[PDB]
Amino acid sequence: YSYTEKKRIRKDFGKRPQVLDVPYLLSIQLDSFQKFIEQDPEGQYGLEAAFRSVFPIQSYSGNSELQYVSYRLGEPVFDVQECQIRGVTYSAPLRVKLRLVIYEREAPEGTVKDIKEQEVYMGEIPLMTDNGTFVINGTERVIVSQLHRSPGVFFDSDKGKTHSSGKVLYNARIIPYRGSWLDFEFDPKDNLFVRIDRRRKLPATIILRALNYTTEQILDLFFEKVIFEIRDNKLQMELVPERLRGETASFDIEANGKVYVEKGRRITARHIRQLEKDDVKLIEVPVEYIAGKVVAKDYIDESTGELICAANMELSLDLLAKLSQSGHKRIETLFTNDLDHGPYISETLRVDPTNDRLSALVEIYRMMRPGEPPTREAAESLFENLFFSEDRYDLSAVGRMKFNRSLLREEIEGSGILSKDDIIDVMKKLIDIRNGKGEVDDIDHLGNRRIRSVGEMAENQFRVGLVRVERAVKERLSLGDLDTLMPQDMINAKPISAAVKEFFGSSQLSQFMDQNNPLSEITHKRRISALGPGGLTRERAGFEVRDVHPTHYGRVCPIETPEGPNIGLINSLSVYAQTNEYGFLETPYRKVTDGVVTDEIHYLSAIEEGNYVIAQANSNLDEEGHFVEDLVTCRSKGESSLFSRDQVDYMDVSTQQVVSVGASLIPFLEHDDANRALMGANMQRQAVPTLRADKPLVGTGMERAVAVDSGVTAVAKRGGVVQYVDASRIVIKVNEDEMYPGEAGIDIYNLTKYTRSNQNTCINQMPCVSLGEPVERGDVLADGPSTDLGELALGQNMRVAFMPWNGYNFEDSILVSERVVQEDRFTTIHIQELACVSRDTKLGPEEITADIPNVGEAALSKLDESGIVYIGAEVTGGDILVGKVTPKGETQLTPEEKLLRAIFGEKASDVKDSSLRVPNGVSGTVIDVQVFTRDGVEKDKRALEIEEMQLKQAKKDLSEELQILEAGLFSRIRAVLVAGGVEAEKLDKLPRDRWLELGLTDEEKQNQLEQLAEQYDELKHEFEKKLEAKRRKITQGDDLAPGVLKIVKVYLAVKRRIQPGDKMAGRHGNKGVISKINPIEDMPYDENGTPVDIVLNPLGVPSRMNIGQILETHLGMAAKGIGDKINAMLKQQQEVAKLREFIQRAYDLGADVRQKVDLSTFSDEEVMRLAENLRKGMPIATPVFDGAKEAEIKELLKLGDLPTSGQIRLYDGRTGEQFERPVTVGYMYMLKLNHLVDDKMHARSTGSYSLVTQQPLGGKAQFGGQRFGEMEVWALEAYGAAYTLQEMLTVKSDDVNGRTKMYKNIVDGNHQMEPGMPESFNVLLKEIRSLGINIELEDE
Amino acid sequence: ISAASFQETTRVLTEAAVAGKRDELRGLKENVIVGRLIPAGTGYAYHQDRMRRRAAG
Amino acid sequence: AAQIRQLAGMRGLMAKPDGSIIETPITANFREGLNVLQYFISTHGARKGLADTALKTANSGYLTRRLVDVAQDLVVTEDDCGTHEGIMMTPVIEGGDV
Amino acid sequence: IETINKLNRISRQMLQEMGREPTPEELAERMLMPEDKIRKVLKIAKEPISMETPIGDDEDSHLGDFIEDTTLELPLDSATTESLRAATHDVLAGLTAREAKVLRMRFGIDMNTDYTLEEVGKQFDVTRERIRQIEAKALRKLRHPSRSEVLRSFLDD
Amino acid sequence: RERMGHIELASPTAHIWFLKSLPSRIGLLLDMPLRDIERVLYFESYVVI
Amino acid sequence: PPDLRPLVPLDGGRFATSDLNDLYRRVINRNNRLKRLLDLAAPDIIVRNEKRMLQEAVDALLDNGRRGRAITGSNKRPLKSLADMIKGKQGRFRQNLLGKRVDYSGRSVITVGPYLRLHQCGLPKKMALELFKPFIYGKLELRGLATTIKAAKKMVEREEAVVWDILDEVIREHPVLLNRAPTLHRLGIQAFEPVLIEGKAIQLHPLVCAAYNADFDGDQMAVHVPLTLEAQLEARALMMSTNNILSPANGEPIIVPSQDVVLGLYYMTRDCVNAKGEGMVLTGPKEAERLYRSGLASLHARVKVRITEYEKDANGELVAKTSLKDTTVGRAILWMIVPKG
Ligand SMILES: [Sr+2]
Ligand SMILES: [Sr+2]
């Protein structure tokens, strides 16, 4: 165990040992983006794939081209922390090496006066953060992975509502990664048709004729050919024994006189023996049998030169007689039946109106472009650019791999463009399935479904940006001069930057980071959605894709998915699953070598699983190799059944591979229903961090894995001994083992303190380590918002008693004690941003000074020196933050107002109050203020004094980093100096700056001091570089929107506490609303007198079918059962060895488990520090499936002197009488999630109205009105209500004259409507009149 | 007025214009759109006062 | 009584994506620990049943909208209608049960 | 129009020659025009946005749906204007006969036209200088806290 | 919000609601298919009055 | 009219115009050109082509989705034509019923109200003060507490102690409608007389919760307030929950106890083999409460109790039959809850 783990040992109730540990949870995001910025030569991945595809751009219109060499990145403008403050997009400038090539017409390729440019600006691409996110405009955003159909070839059946009877069809679909769609389908008339780019139906032979295939060549490729012969006037045929089987012959089948099958005789199997043995090659056939058959080749008269019969034509009695007249020897036909061979291609040729290649190319052009008449040059150009051009059509690396995989090919490698042989092979396989021999692939199969992450989706958006540029490049090459207009001026950076920015913060799969909790931060990054571009919409593909497919097993989580309209489209990625080399989903497996099981780990794709027999993790193993039982529950090729030991090829790694991270933290998932585990995983993501995070008593073991991988918690890069601890800075001295020669061994860990999130929650990094503690790599140094010591801590746990109350737990409702409010356990910190923008108008520019003509000095007491409110001022809903004034002009005073001005004296000329005020409600206090100014600067005194604070703090932040790094550098120098020449007392007296000149005799240690002296000068050099850059950013004139002078943003930290209305939920789906905060007096208590914290309804368990919350309650009191006995000790102070025996007994319960905690060999200092952490209960881990047993919890309950049943007798606080039945009391992990009652409560009587329609609208001061829909109208129509709906339609809605006249009646005390014409119908009347249709109102 | 509420609007408005139709406002859905009292419940006794005076006047 | 069956006794039989019922039902109840294969089997009906519920409100809501638009313009006109004619009403008996 | 076309040609040049973006201070130097001219044209050159521009969709909403009307006065303010005229009428009634007629002409209260000091003198029997005396006399009695407690509440605006 | 204006057309232009909307209000009134009306309106062929 | 198709300056400074304005310009432009071409030499080819687009210009203005498809001058979208204003799922004809915004309306998360009556709901204090805003000003100048409207506005914003007293006076006897989404039947909107409770959450009666499809876990309800005497009466006489105890679908009552109430009466009425106190004679149903809450007898066990039941007479009501019944202790206490008739 590590030192960070030794302070808090979690008792694991697992049985199966961990073979493969949990990997990096955000590996999908980081590894994929590094492919985009990868400098890979030939390995086409990311940017290098995008540039080399288009470039070198050539133009033979003016004989000139532009070439590509390599690209540059690095040098970011602002840091990840600096981007969030001043609102800058975190991106690195892309500069590409480009050179213009000039050709002269004399030699094949003659270059004259070549000009090369080093760096050309091509916009800037957003870089991924240290965790796995992008900072766009200031806010942190995530790119969601896309789930789509894999490029290659698909085969679909579709046998639903078709034709009339229900004829089963077969469809072949060639889908590329970039290009046009190829569809081959059969129609109700049995014929085959081709669809180009999913449009009109063309005959299947039209695509072959365009590929230069004659009518003779089309029939040659697919069909078997029967050869008829003309010998001595009579007609004969070449015989094949396989052709005549089952079908009754109407003629006498004879060979050289001998008759085998005569008129009115059937052929079975006996006759296919007599003809084979007698060496029969030629038989006599009548004129009737040949007539009706389809010819294959053209046969002309060799004496005249005229066409008798062309390819694909019906034969008759007269046509066969002319063939003997001409003098022909051979006739070639086709062999087509009704079962295994059919004339699908043959019958389409007659339907096909085209004659040659040119005719076919025009028909394709007319389908794609039905407007302009085509020429031969235009028709040939379009077809070659469809599926044969490299710049237009591409299968990519994965497409050709899967394309050759289904068609059964030798090679997996190939070109992106489809060849002429590839198109025929897809057509050949489609006929095979129609005949019989052929299988239909599944669309829902994960072996046919790919994952488009971040780097792959950004590559396609960058490629189309280059397509937008290449049009302007090649056209201007022949347009102008090639002597002056050379390098940079040719390519513009505007089209590139616009295409990239509309993807990172505008696309459907690019949303805000759901940073409610570290779990929601991780799960959102590994979300897989099938709603991206080139995928599926909300109302498409039916419900088949939404359903769980057996391939999901250990790749996609079956339970964790949105329960809304998406259900199935958006899915969570499982723990151990990763992306392979071709984008397919794969899950690790234990390799079994026919007997013994080895720790060999193999990642297998969805296609690979349908071959091997996979054993379940539920089975027990003998020793560590082979199985115990002969009959083992296994799964193979989709289905799952029992198998022998020798047939087993693979096994599951762990019993956690099927469930994703979001639902992995759920304690007793086995005892929960799949419907409520679906909901319970979603409730954990909405959880809001409490003021003080507390460890979960009933955990799983993944709590520690979530905290580290989230990136919100500060982890040690190297480790060693902690030198100085602060609530902002944690510095560490390296253990010298991982310290490499060159620089000082001190790492600075700067902590983010109180920062605003996307969901307005607080982000805080509290220190954990004490001064003088040894830690290593991977050790947790600081905790985030919802994390405890090393582990995840979502929303704390309270005392839970399942008992009915006096109607305060009617339906899902949950009670709370006053102690929950008194002790800050559910107090949530919310940081809010409020912006004040001074704007330039046509009347006059706006000012932001403390000169309010209306209020003063009452609200101006909070506001300080002419501008904004002071830092750290407690303000309530109504106080003024930024004093904004706006010029209005005119201000015509009414006769009555003119008198009022003369009586008292009033000053309100042009100056109108429009100041930034606190939203109407209850708010906290001001934390920080920021003022952004125009490019003309014109600094305000308040804006100038804060920049003085920004400069001095940044000076100290950079100076303190140098001081510590210098201290550790010269301390390392002393270690080198002492070793060899002992001067422990001599060097201390000498000044430390004169240590650089001193050194040992020129050896290997002299080279060691060479790097130390170089780094000292390097640290002093980079300090000046960082300070110059820091001074520039503060004094920099902030660029903003036009018509804006100054933007002031005042941040407020609201400390809102828990109250009735807030949404509380468990981990198993048990959600509820808080009824009433009851005092500690009336709430139930134990025999010893311990009051219960929260009371939850017991009725919402058997119908809900979630037993996981009950077993969490039983183990909850059991967890504190050990903790209370540790709490009973130490206070009285018992012996350390006496305390040591009880703790050792606690970690070893139930005879045999798995987790072996060190047998009391911890040091006296470590045991006492551990017992302090275990004082408030014992952390118990229960795995996802192989967790704590039902009998094991009862055994742990007896350790802490508690009943095995879990039910204890309680006393009522109000009466004092006993509850006539024992109630189950324990500890369940409760969650105070998002969308609280403070944000949900809205109320309006009167306010602002919209412009186009005169109905209520919300924006400032008062909230928006509630919509009265047509479903609510039916209710009032069903009731005898008439005057209430009259109110809803006129005075409460659109009627202009109605609302104001009615409002005055309320104040006067009249309560009368007096309704008129609503503006909803008044606009409608003018809209019909403007069309040209007379509509008028007629009287009585 | 009642038809164009849920049916196709352009077909109804063209049919009403050619034929020269008159909507006397008797249906419940007809009076909700124009902003008048419903010929049902409380407004039913109100509606009978105007329908009776169409024959005489 | 159907909910108590799954928790204490036996969960029962589950369905396949095609619509057919699986050969071997889940023997384990919610009192004891369910298997990895058994829980993955039970998820199908959970993500199919709730998927039907997501569009159940849209389908029944359209059915409510449908029946209104045809019958909304109907109110009571007279106190009594002068016809002694109606519908014959008999207790519904299916086979041999009321 | 010629200046807008001139802006786009130099914007392509200065973006890649310098590195980042042309600022109004730097853009004005190459155009040979003052900063107040360039920063003015940039606002005029922008095309008016469409009314039915979708923002986020989801529940289906357009840009023209969220635009509020500033022309409409608040029903609370409309009741204030009615209450002010009713209060002043009771206030003018407390004045001694002729004191109400002068203020209703000097400020145009309840009358269509506003009258000047010279116009009252010739149509009130009294002299020109006296009008200034009785005007302040009428105001002083309404400056008193006991009489005008209702009028002091309208001073909040 | 209530006042309207007018545009005087130099040439008579047909209404789309009475022409394209099935089964044509102008077509049924004159007993003439839409293909014959459009070719005249669009300026391709003459029609006898 | 220009107001229906407006050019308004936005908050930023960039203008916002209707798609109708862009369509109208491309009608007048070729209309002015045709007036020019008819007097400045008229070749048939050009004149017929100018008349060709002018016909299309009106066509695109009236109904754009018929002959071709016009593209906006700056945006890549089909323009909202005159026909597109009326139809299109959400327009002007269809928003008269569905897309209707309403004043004097609130919204909050529902909570339980066991102490409340059937005609009572637990409406929030800060919500009711905001909703009945004009109702406060009306009964504040009338009382003589506030001088004018502006003085009454300052008293409400400052949250004065006297305003809370007047607020309760206006709310009393004033019904308030409560709406839940979605409304399938008419009982989705029911009127309730509000009782002021401090908090941001609205409390609902457990019995009427059976009428809605509501569960206290994260559901929200709309709070509508009637204004006129006619609106107040048709809320009490028709839309009140006490008046609507039965369902309109069937003769069976919709307001029926569930969950906690059923479990409470089930335990009270059920009998045990031999509980505390059995075989007593008991004087009235009042002595049954004397034994249980004191601690001498349990609710169960078959104990003889003296009861006085009143049956319905032919005319009503004189029948008063008293007899010894063999029930339990818990059954006798519940008889006191049961009415005489
Ligand atoms: Sr790990
Ligand atoms: Sr006189």
Ligand SMILES: [Sr+2]
């Ligand atoms: Sr319910």
Ligand SMILES: [Sr+2]
């Ligand atoms: Sr719900």
